[PDB]
Amino acid sequence: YRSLFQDLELKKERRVILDCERDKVNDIVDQVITIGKHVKGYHYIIANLGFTDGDLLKIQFGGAEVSGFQIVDYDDSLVSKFIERWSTLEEKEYPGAHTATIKYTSALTYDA
Amino acid sequence: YRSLFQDLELKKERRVILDCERDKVNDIVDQVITIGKHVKGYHYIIANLGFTDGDL
């Protein structure tokens, strides 16, 4: 992945549209963190519905501007009353429930 | 520490000589990683005998 962005510096691209799983997205972000392309000048677009699921705090103040899509608006009270019911659940009973946010795959599962 | 390097961008320095404990050195490195001043153009000098002890 070092040689990947070095191949991107053969044309010196600033405009990267990632389309990966959020685990693989966070891998690529850590590669960008390793080489410092999160600085001002670059721009990123995360092509999934779990834009809030990815780690934004580690690249919030690097300099590049990251765009994305969140299908589940957390400011909605229909969502927020579910979130207040979400985090209060036990991790030993419901793993992944005692969290501030939720994956969209879990949300559409609840919507299903 | 965000505002620290923003104050260093008031004169836009590329030449930082750190003199801290290696725990506090690794804190400042993670701040540089957070803001991306580890890119080409900057230069750093770690003023201790444990240069290999820090996360390079």
Side-chain angles (χ1 to χ4, degrees):
Chain A
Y1 292 172
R2 288 181 180 90
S3 178
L4 180 62
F5 292 97
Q6 289 175 356
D7 290 330
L8 293 177
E9 289 293 324
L10 297 176
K11 294 181 181 180
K12 295 184 180 181
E13 295 294 326
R14 300 288 183 270
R15 297 174 177 178
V16 177
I17 300 169
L18 296 175
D19 192 0
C20 294
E21 295 178 354
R22 65 178 297 276
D23 292 331
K24 299 298 293 296
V25 166
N26 290 318
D27 293 331
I28 298 168
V29 172
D30 293 333
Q31 297 294 319
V32 173
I33 290 166
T34 308
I35 63 176
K37 291 189 182 297
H38 55 88
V39 299
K40 188 184 288 184
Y42 290 90
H43 195 280
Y44 296 98
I45 295 170
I46 308 299
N48 55 4
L49 297 179
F51 179 71
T52 63
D53 293 330
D55 192 2
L56 269 67
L57 296 174
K58 197 173 181 180
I59 41 92
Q60 182 178 357
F61 297 98
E65 294 179 353
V66 179
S67 297
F69 304 107
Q70 182 63 41
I71 195 66
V72 177
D73 184 74
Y74 292 97
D75 289 331
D76 292 331
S77 66
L78 189 147
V79 176
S80 179
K81 289 180 181 179
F82 175 74
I83 294 298
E84 291 175 352
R85 191 170 64 244
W86 182 247
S87 66
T88 55
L89 292 174
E90 186 178 4
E91 185 180 1
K92 184 179 183 293
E93 179 66 29
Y94 296 103
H98 186 75
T99 56
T101 62
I102 191 172
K103 292 182 182 180
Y104 69 99
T105 61
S106 300
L108 293 171
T109 303
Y110 180 77
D111 289 330
Chain B
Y1 292 172
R2 288 181 180 90
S3 178
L4 180 62
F5 292 97
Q6 289 175 356
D7 290 330
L8 293 177
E9 289 293 324
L10 297 176
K11 294 181 181 180
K12 295 184 180 181
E13 295 294 326
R14 299 288 183 270
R15 297 174 177 178
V16 176
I17 300 169
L18 296 175
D19 192 0
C20 294
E21 295 178 354
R22 65 178 297 276
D23 292 331
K24 299 298 293 296
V25 167
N26 290 318
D27 293 331
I28 298 168
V29 172
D30 293 333
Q31 297 294 319
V32 173
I33 290 166
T34 308
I35 63 176
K37 291 189 182 298
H38 55 88
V39 299
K40 188 184 288 184
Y42 290 90
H43 195 280
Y44 296 98
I45 295 170
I46 308 299
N48 55 4
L49 297 179
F51 179 70
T52 63
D53 293 330
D55 192 2
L56 269 67

